[PDB]
């Protein structure tokens, strides 16, 4: 038993990280087969980040302007191209440690692991969610650009995120085809994230994890309707709940014998009375960064090969 | 910027995990050079866990009673021995993926990463601390025994923990020489953890991380003395603060220009007035599982090779 913010093992991703230098700008790249992927703003200078014209910047470059380092080994760039906001650098050596992979675009509310890197070198791994406003609350310093986010599916690494920029305390990036999550652009202008909301289905999955681990004090005998719940959730900035969410929570209600709409009644009380100084799973706030699948995986124990 | 419960990249450890089967009991083992390390209770039967005599159990076994699997490869056990509470299984193949390693015993208050495994297969990575009562608050299901805890030092993996048992919601284990943390034994008897306390030096390091990231509301102009602080800390079950702790916090006070004893005055107020419904770094409780070194690493950005 127990419950922890758990990330995926990062070994399969660590073997794909490289250092990409262009000029005096160094960041991380992702090396799969003979392509290195990295943020396109590696080709900006400190006198361009205000309003770059990336097509102009790229035509003025040749392959030898791109220093790609894998450990102490140098990779020769033999071709480059731009795909939306990422650069694809073709190199002469296919990465022998290339795992089975796919590129997927995730939805708000889903979680993934981030392998934070500096100078091509893995520094740390942590779990986070894509927020409803298409930012993540990460931990990134200068030089972390190009760090990637990923899930693991049995044996396949699904790459879903590449890091590009910090806004005001939060973090924004692209999928691996180079398309931004959210209405952001990769230039330094005054852009801000929209209003964040609480991911309701995730809070309910976490209350089920609590019940599974012995925390029961917030339960009650009431029920509510989907519609009566969503009227209260709206007032507290919670995402509305759909019949799809109920079905997804099905495995957890079956395991605890507590109906989804029963649990919504407890959440309604917590939202109106507060925690009153008690904690749930070691937290004094309602946690919304575990999906129903995260709870199942951790409270049942799925491995990976 | 940002602040996350961050674990070490697990790649170097994933290559050392194996499945160890003896009878109908399967758990994980650690494979370094030609030795596999695992909990000695793999040689217990379901009719022995009450009060085993491990020396008797071990003499009744031969090498071929031990099935060691590395992926889909079988390792031949050519010798075994007992070292306190762990089994050392000598095998015919040295692990080619053996990293540079040391075995270290950590102290209460220090943190490490746990690679939770099932059937020799890595499932997840998370960070935790060794509590003052020598338990950890982990997340472990049946079959997780043999999972290891580790720090990474530049290029060397320091192994500090092997998992053995769950008590009442918390988790207990040994160092890699087989000696338990705390006064626990590896049998099923009624043993309980002593009283846990809050790791004061870690709470202060986390308040500094908050200041570094813009959270300043709890600061004040007061100072206190080491002695006046420890009188309040005692009442709230906080570990007493020593002059060694002050010095360790030195790098963080220098970076924020806030003296250690100034910050103790703010902590004293938080302990006496409470949070009053505000949060610090996204938490409504005082967090004690980041060491001063964890804060420096994350708020400055140390990598590993
Ligand atoms: C690449 O490592 C870096 C990521 C930042 C550095 C600090 N933390 C991060 O996540 N990227 C940039 O520096 C990026 C460059 C292009 C978008 C031109 N810009 C960026 O993040 O700075 C804009 C900003 C605005 C307001 C607050 C903080 C940053
Ligand atoms: C090995 O994977 C397993 C670890 C437990 C299983 C559930 N979560 C864990 O961390 N080890 C055991 O089953 C262990 C066997 C030897 C110590 C004989 N015993 C154990 O943890 O059960 C004792 C216990 C007492 C009270 C509550 C829970 C467990």
Q: Are strands A148-153 and B66-70 parallel, antiparallel or unpaired?
A: unpaired
Among the partner-chain residues A1, A115, A116, the one whose CB lies closest to the CB of B169 is A1
Structural method: X-ray
Residue B145 burial (CB count, 10 A): 25
Largest CA distance in chain A: 69
Residue A243 burial (CB count, 10 A): 9
CA distance A68 to A26: 10
> How many domains is chain A partitioned into structurally?
3
Interchain contact, A301 vs B118, CB within 8 Å? yes
Interchain contact, B7 vs A126, CB within 8 Å? yes
Q: What φ, ψ does residue A114 adopt, rounded to 5°?
A: -120, 125
Q: Which long-range contacts (CB under 8 A, 24 or more apart) does A250-256 make?
A: A251/A292, A251/A296, A252/A205, A252/A208, A252/A212, A252/A292, A252/A295, A252/A296, A253/A208, A255/A208, A255/A212, A256/A208, A256/A211, A256/A212
**In Å, what is the CA distance from B66 to each residue of B52, B62, B163?**
19, 8, 20
Q: Are B205 and B294 in contact (CB under 8 A)?
A: yes
Residue B9 within a domain = no
Residues in chain A within 8 Å Cβ distance of B121: 303-305
Q: What φ, ψ does residue B285 adopt, rounded to 5°?
A: -125, 160
Residue B187 within a domain = no
Same domain for A44 and A86: yes
Q: Are A270 and B90 in contact (CB under 8 A)?
A: no
* Residue among A41, A164, A171, A245 flagged as catalytic: A41
Mutation target among B119, B125, B146 for the A interface, most CBs of A within 10 A: B125
**In Å, what is the CA distance from B8 to each residue of A158, A163, B128?**
21, 19, 11
Q: Which of A91, A116, A146 is the last residue of a domain?
A: A91
CATH of the domain at A213: 1.10.1840.10
Residue A184 within a domain = no
CATH of the domain at A71: 2.40.10.10
Residue A59 within a domain = yes
Q: Are B293 and B153 in contact (CB under 8 A)?
A: no
- In the numeric block, which tokens belong to residue A85? 């906001």
End-to-end CA distance of chain B: 23
Interchain contact, B1 vs A117, CB within 8 Å? no
Q: What φ, ψ does residue B57 adopt, rounded to 5°?
A: -60, -35
End-to-end CA distance of chain A: 23
**Cα–Cα nearest to A44, from A138, A121, A140, A145:** A145
User: How many beta-carbon pairs below 8 A join chains A and B?
Assistant: 151
Q: Which of B31, B58, B91 is the last residue of a domain?
A: B91
Residue B2 burial (CB count, 10 A): 21
Interchain contact, B123 vs A213, CB within 8 Å? no
CA distance B193 to A197: 40
CA dihedral (A291, A292, A295, A301) positive or negative: negative
- In the numeric block, which tokens belong to residue A56? 């102009």
Among A165, A180, A185, residue to substitute to test ligand 1 (most atoms within 8 Å of Cβ):
A165
Interchain contact, A141 vs B300, CB within 8 Å? yes
Residue A282 within a domain = yes
SS3 readout for chain B: CCCCCCECCCHHHHCCEEEEEECCEEEEEEEECCEEEEEHHHHCCCCCCCCCCHHHHHHCCCHHHEEEEECCEEECEEEEEEECCEEEEEECCCCCCCCCEEECCCCCCCEEEEEEEECCEEEEEEEEECCCCCCECCCCCCCCCCCEEEEEECCEEEEEEEEEEECCCCEEEECCCCCECCCCCCCCCCCCCCCCCECHHHHHHHHHHHHHCCCCCCCCCCCCCHHHHHHHHHHCCECCCCHHHHHHCHHHHHHHCCCHHHHHHHHHHHHHHCCCCCCECCECCCCCCCCHHHHHHHHHHCCCC
Q: Are strands B156-166 and B101-103 parallel, antiparallel or unpaired?
A: parallel
Which of the 8 DSSP states describes residue A143?
A: T
Nearest chain B residue to A118, by CA: B303
Nearest chain A residue to B140, by CA: A1
Give the residue whose CA is nearest to atom 14 of ligand 1: A165
| Structural domain containing residue B207 | 200-301
Q: Which of B47, B66, B91 is the last residue of a domain?
A: B91
Q: What φ, ψ does residue B202 adopt, rounded to 5°?
A: -70, -40
CA distance A253 to A242: 16
Which neighbouring-strand residues pair with B112?
B128
- Report residues whose beta carbon is within 6 angstroms of any ligand 2 atom: B 27, 41, 44, 49, 140-145, 164-168, 171, 186-188
Residue A3 within a domain = no
Q: Are A156 and A304 in contact (CB under 8 A)?
A: no
Residue B181 within a domain = no
Residue B273 within a domain = yes
CA distance B267 to B236: 11
Is A171 catalytic? The answer is no
Q: Are B304 and A121 in contact (CB under 8 A)?
A: yes
């Amino acid at each position: 038993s127990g419950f922890r913010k758990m990330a995926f093992p990062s070994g399969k991703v660590e073997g794909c990280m490289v250092q990409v230098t262009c000029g005096t700008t160094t960041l991380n790249g992702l090396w799969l087969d003979d392509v290195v992927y990295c943020p396109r703003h590696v080709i900006c200078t400190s006198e361009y980040m205000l309003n770059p014209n990336y097509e102009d910047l790229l035509i003025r470059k040749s392959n030898h302007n791109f220093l790609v380092q894998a450990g102490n080994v140098q990779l020769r760039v033999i071709g480059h191209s731009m795909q939306n906001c990422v650069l694809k650098l073709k190199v002469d050596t296919a990465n022998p440690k290339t795992p089975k992979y796919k590129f997927v675009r995730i939805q708000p509310g889903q979680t993934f692991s981030v392998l934070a890197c500096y100078n091509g070198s893995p520094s740390g791994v942590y779990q986070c969610a894509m927020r409803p406003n298409f930012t993540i609350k990460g931990s990134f310093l200068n030089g972390s650009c190009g760090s990637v986010g990923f899930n693991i599916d049995y044996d396949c690494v699904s790459f879903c995120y590449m890091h590009h920029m910090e806004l005001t305390g939060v973090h924004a990036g692209t999928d691996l085809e180079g398309n931004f999550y959210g209405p952001f652009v990769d230039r330094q202008t005054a852009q801000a994230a929209g209003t964040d909301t609480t991911i309701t289905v995730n809070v309910l999955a976490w209350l089920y994890a609590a019940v599974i681990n012995g925390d029961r004090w917030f339960l009650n005998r009431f029920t509510t309707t989907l519609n009566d719940f969503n009227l209260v959730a709206m007032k507290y900035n919670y995402e509305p709940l759909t019949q799809d969410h109920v079905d997804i929570l099905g495995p957890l209600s079956a395991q605890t014998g507590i109906a989804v709409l029963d649990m919504c009644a407890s959440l309604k009380e917590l939202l109106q009375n507060g925690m009153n100084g008690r904690t749930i799973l070691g937290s004094a706030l309602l946690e919304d960064e575990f999906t129903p699948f995260d709870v199942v995986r951790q409270c049942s124990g799925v491995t990976f090969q």
